[PDB]
Each structure stands twice: as C-alpha cells, then as structure tokens.
Amino acid sequence: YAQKLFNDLFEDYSNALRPVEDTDKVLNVTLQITLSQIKDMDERNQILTAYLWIRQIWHDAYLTWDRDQYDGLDSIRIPSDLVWRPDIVLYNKADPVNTNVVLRYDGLITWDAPAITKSSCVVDVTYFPFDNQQCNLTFGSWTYNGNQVDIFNALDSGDLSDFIEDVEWEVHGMPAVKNVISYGCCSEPYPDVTFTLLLKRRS
Amino acid sequence: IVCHTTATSPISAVTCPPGENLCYRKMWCDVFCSSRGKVVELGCAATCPSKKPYEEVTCCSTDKCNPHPKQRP
C-alpha cells in the first residue's frame, strides 16, 4: 500500500526547509483563486467579504518516488501542515479551515483550499455603468522573497467559471497582475499577484 | 539621467525618459513596516513629487543617486 510510500518521504523531511536541491535556486509556485461568492458587499465600510478556493501548485524535490516499483501508485493525498508550503497569505486583508494536498510521483503538489477574505474596496465612478467598485485582492508570501519563492498566476484572469452570479453585484472583470514590492527592510523584492475585481448593479 | 527604478525585478538601473530629469525615492508604510521595514518606490520624475503626509521622500539630480537602502550610491 501507499503507506510504505508514506513510510516515508517524511523522516528525511520536515516542513521547515525549502525542498530545492540547494538553497539559492528558486522554488516557483503557481497560484490561482476561484471566486465562488460575494458574501456581502459592505458598501458603507467599503469592505468586501468573499468565499474562495485557492489553488497553489509547486514541486518538492524531496517527496519523489518511482511509481513502477511502488505497485505504480501515481499519487497520494496528505496533510498540508505536513508538507512545506509557501506561506502564501492575503496582503490586502482588513480583518481558513485546513485540508489536504495531492502529492504526485514526480514531487508535484496540488493544494486547493478555501478562504474567507475581508479586503478593502474603492470607488471612483465613471468607467460608468452608474456604480463601479474596485476590490483588489493581493496575495504574496508571508516569509519568502522572490529569490526564495517566486509566485505566478495560472492565468491573467481570476477564475470566474464557478462564480455564482449575485443578484445585486455583477463581476465585470477579474484580471490578474504581477508586481514586486521592494520593502526598505532588505532583501530582494516580494512578488505579489493581484486579482482585481470590478462589479456594478441593476436599478 | 540614469535612475534606479523598483518596477524591475531584480532592482537595476534605467535611463529615465526625456523631461524626467530627477531621480526620486519614496517611502510610506504598509503595516508590514514593523516586520519588514518601510515600502520603497524608486524611479524617475520630471518634477520632485510633492506627495503624502508620511514620507521619507528624496530627490536627486546626479546619475546613480537614488539607491534603495541596499548599499551606497
């Protein structure tokens, strides 16, 4: 069974050090959100509350096994707190429920996970329709520069597809943009993607 | 003029546009400030940007002259 694959990959590994062969090469990560719902467009504090799923994909050079000789098992699901994760958080926050990861034979990891976010929104209205509201969602790592971890969007839109058409608020766009943030503390820039949500409403 | 611009990853040197003769430095605050000090925007400008209530803004007219707190000019 796969428990002798899981025998494990985990005596010579614990989530602390980045699973690259040696330190000063880079571990990239693919990131995309799947917007599910606008829980509340708090107009009068300009806070957007939203339910989301967060896709993060990356390679762990230490969690590889040859499949043929483990009775050909392609991949296992395992605890996120048990594998190295890019501690990728919400930069844009204003004010979340643990799951598991699909690790592949080639050391590829796929973590979807759900989120609630209170993020700030801004109005400046024309680009009419009557009322557009811009709500940016900026994600980036909590502990790692682009020289330890670079982070890419899966595509230059935030996935609506399984978006769930709210009755007063209308997603017109959700483009993504990739920036670096400098930060006077030090030490290389901090990569960050920004899903930018633009809504209006029927009257 | 040749200024450092932070639009670039990694940080590096650019020759500013025509008419934008000054190099500048902008620093406001995230609230990552405590954790990773101060956010820095380096670039070019035609006139030194007047700006904000809370800054560590700096102009210069020399080549070289707006480096991040990285090292020295």
Ligand SMILES: *[C@@H]1O[C@H](CO)[C@@H](O)[C@H](O)[C@H]1NC(C)=O
């Ligand atoms: C990081 O991503 C780039 C493409 O975006 C890729 O060419 C590079 O090889 C990746 N890093 C490493 C260490 O392979």
Ligand SMILES: *[C@@H]1O[C@H](CO)[C@@H](O)[C@H](O)[C@H]1NC(C)=O
């Ligand atoms: C949202 O992000 C985009 C790029 O990340 C930027 O053009 C825009 O100014 C941002 N909006 C706000 C309100 O910060």
